[PDB]
Design a protein around this nucleic acid. Structure first.
Lengths: 53, 77, 225, 50
RNA sequence: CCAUAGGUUAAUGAGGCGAACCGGGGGAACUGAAACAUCUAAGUACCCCGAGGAAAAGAAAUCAACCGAGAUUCCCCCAG
RNA sequence: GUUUAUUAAAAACACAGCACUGUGCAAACACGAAAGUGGACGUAUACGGUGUGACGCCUGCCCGGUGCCGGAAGGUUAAUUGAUGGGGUUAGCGCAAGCGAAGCUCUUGAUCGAAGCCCCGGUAAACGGCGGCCGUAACUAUAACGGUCCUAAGGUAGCGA
RNA sequence: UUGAGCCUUGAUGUGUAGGAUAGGUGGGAGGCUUUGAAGUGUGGACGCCAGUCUGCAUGGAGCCGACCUUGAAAUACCACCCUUUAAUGUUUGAUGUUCUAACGUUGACCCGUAAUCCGGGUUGCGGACAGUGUCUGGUGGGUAGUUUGACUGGGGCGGUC
RNA sequence: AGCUUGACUGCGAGCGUGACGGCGCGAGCAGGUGCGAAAGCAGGUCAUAGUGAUCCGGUGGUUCUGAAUGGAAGGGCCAUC
RNA sequence: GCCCGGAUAGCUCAGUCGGUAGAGCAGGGGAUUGAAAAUCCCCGUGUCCUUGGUUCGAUUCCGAGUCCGGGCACCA
């Protein structure tokens, strides 16, 4: 899946970007802890506002 | 019972169609796996015995969206 | 291994690129920095089994613009065929009874042609023409009654092609001095030839890889099609 | 057994062909005979032999 | 810590039985093929769950064929 | 001691003992679609299977076949992956024969690919095998012995109608 | 870190006559060297220690081709490649280790709860293994469904069809 | 021994033998060939055994069919495995 | 049916990235010992299964085919 990052993280750090990460790394450590979030299209625009604004 | 608590999938009966076409009743046991899901709206590890495909359905809709469908049909977690 | 004069032109060609017959003819002209008019050559890895008689690519083709070089022809005929060979344009025309004299010191030519009724005399002692690709053979189009014609095509710019016992074939198609468009017509003239000489049992892509090159130059990948 | 089974094909553009057998042992050469052809309605050459 | 799990009380409803019909989950064998495994027997016997007075199905991503018909179900032909 | 209750109570079965082998614990194994339980609320001086059957003297030869326990260069090889080639459809180009892009589709089936089997090394208190034809020891006879039959080896002790 | 394909880049070939550790087909009587060569002096290196290549450097201004031989002639130069082999890279895989956030926990502790079950939580030890589901090959009388012909001086054997 | 392919293709009145399936003989007719000067002969070999039903597929030919139309797939027919 | 390997002297077998094809067993003989044993050596009766291709040259390398050995595939 794509999903956006909230924290820094390792090889994909950017504090906010869409990277094709395996559903295993996301739904297990990333999201289930606070470092990523599923790009349900409703969040990609949500955090997008944080960028500009 | 080995039945997905989400997709509702359960052991379906079939037949072991061999080379000589010898019918033999069997079953397709779903790939269920007791996984511990975390809910941000409740702060708890809601463990649910769902199949492989049942988990992906939770990724799109959401653990909160899935549970909402459970409490609706009497499902207790 | 190579020298600057060779490492300089190597940078003018992309090893990992399959140029077109129209782009290869122009680039080839820039791959000849030698101090003499180099000749154009085109090799290709035929997808055939060189170790199978029923899969041999051999014959002759006439270039639409010749090879751009003089080809001293030497024909060996008998009877009236002697005159027809001389008036044809053959540089040297020796009789069948004087075939030994040529082996002595009169051996200066690029190609040899003979008549069917004179292959039993030239056939023997051919240990000097065979290993030099000068041994007349009805296959290469150097053995036929109409020697008058055969010689004319050779003097016009006809080139022979024969795949080695490995699966590769190379033949001249002119010089580098020739214009771009000119070379293209000549190159395609050969490409269409091999396709016509393709064996029936040939399986897989007959044309696996084609590449052109000069005398003192590197090769260039080109799409035959 | 041994004496294989062949089929003479019409040398013409037709697809007609006659069936028969031969001795591949001492007769490996390609058989060829002129027979009638119901398609072209003319005796055409018949080759092809195993 | 919050919050839940849990505990208590109250209201409502459910539980059982029952000849057939009905939907769904399970699902043979004997037998026939003059044997026999594909096949047939049969999605029948039987087991189990649920509901009604009917149940089930049901308002086209269906057929037809250039002319139309227009949800489902039932009966007679089509056709052994 | 046990056993065919009701025609066989025996040389059968069981038996302490001995041997091989499996098992490191959530054991092997067994009952079960699963859970669980038994094995055992035990821990290799334990437990399960098999074989033999107090004790005394001892328990040989043979690893080809069939199994088991290992190793291993090369060879073959499933699912899956889908390289090439061929065919159907058709925008266009052809005055017509014909060919025919993209897309779609059908078909054909390289490459990727562990076990297994074969091969090789062991195991016979594993299932079993432990025989034929000749020559010979200077009275006969027999055969200590020596070849062969290529099936692995061809009867030690003891005993023997 | 590495086994194999693939693509450039560099090595690489001891039948015999012989100036000599000749790959096969082709182009080819000249390119090469003052963008500083032969010829000597070392290191690295292949290896049948026969011989050859090369960076650096000394030096400094040459080295060659039918040659008369060889079935086949050039380290004179350049291409498409093979045999063999080495190093980057690319591609498809393989191996092992570390880590923890799933998963396992018939370790300890706490609570529900004066409870050997179970559930939640904490912690420790393992760990993307194990296990399980689907597909697949092998194995499989533990188990299940059956076949295992008929003539025939009865049947069986033999023979026959 | 010379010349060659009638061991050919579409039919065949009539007749023989079998429960049937099936098999066998057949002058002659039409088209196209070989041999001989010609009259004629040849639809394998002196004749009689040298054999394999069906179903299911493969190959070539034939627009016969082409589940909306135009094709194609498939099927059918002939030859054949 | 597909694929790999094998077929070598009378027998059992080794062998090559393309070229005088060897060993063992057996037999005759020789050497050696004073002699009989042993031991060692010499002596060979081949289209390298069959038909082609490349080559100056094929038991080799390649293609087809046959027998045999191993595995897999094998629904009229």
């Amino acid at each position: 899946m794509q999903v956006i990052l909230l924290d820094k993280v390792a090889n994909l750090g950017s504090l906010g970007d869409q990277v094709n990460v395996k559903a295993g790394y996301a739904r297990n450590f990333l999201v289930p802890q606070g470092k990523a979030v599923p790009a349900t299209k409703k969040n990609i625009e949500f955090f997008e506002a944080r960028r500009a604004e | 019972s080995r039945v997905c608590q989400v997709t509702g999938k359960r052991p379906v009966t079939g037949n072991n169609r061999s080379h000589a076409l010898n019918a033999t009743k069997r079953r397709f046991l779903p790939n269920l796996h007791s996984h511990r899901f975390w809910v941000e709206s409740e702060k708890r590890f809601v463990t649910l015995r769902v199949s492989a495909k049942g988990m992906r359905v939770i990724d799109k809709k959401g653990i909160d969206t899935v549970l909402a469908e459970l409490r609706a049909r009497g499902e207790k977690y | 291994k190579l020298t600057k004069r060779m490492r300089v032109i190597r940078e003018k060609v992309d090893a990992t690129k399959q140029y077109d017959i129209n782009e290869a003819i122009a680039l080839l002209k820039e791959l000849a920095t030698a101090k003499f008019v180099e000749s154009v050559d085109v090799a290709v890895n035929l997808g055939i089994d060189a170790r199978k008689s029923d899969q041999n690519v051999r014959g002759a083709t006439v270039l639409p613009h010749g090879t751009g070089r003089s080809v001293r022809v030497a024909v060996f005929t008998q009877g009236a065929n002697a005159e027809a060979a001389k008036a044809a344009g053959a540089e040297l025309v020796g009789m069948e009874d004087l075939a030994d004299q040529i082996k002595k010191g009169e051996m200066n030519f690029d190609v040899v042609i003979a008549s069917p009724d004179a292959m039993r005399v030239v056939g023997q002692l051919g240990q000097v023409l065979g290993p030099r690709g000068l041994m007349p053979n009805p296959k290469v189009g150097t053995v036929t009654p109409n020697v008058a014609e055969a010689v004319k095509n050779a003097k016009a710019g006809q080139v022979r092609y024969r795949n080695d016992k490995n699966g590769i074939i190379h033949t001249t198609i002119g010089k580098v001095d020739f214009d771009a468009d000119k070379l293209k017509e000549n190159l395609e003239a050969l490409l269409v030839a091999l396709k016509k000489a393709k064996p029936t049992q040939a399986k897989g892509v007959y044309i696996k890889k084609v590449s052109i090159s000069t005398t003192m130059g590197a090769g260039v990948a080109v799409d035959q099609a | 057994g041994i004496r294989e089974k062949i089929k003479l094909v019409s040398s013409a553009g037709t697809g007609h062909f006659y069936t028969t057998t031969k001795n591949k042992r001492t007769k490996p050469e390609k058989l060829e005979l002129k027979k009638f052809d119901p398609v072209v309605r003319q005796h055409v050459i018949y080759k092809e032999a195993k």
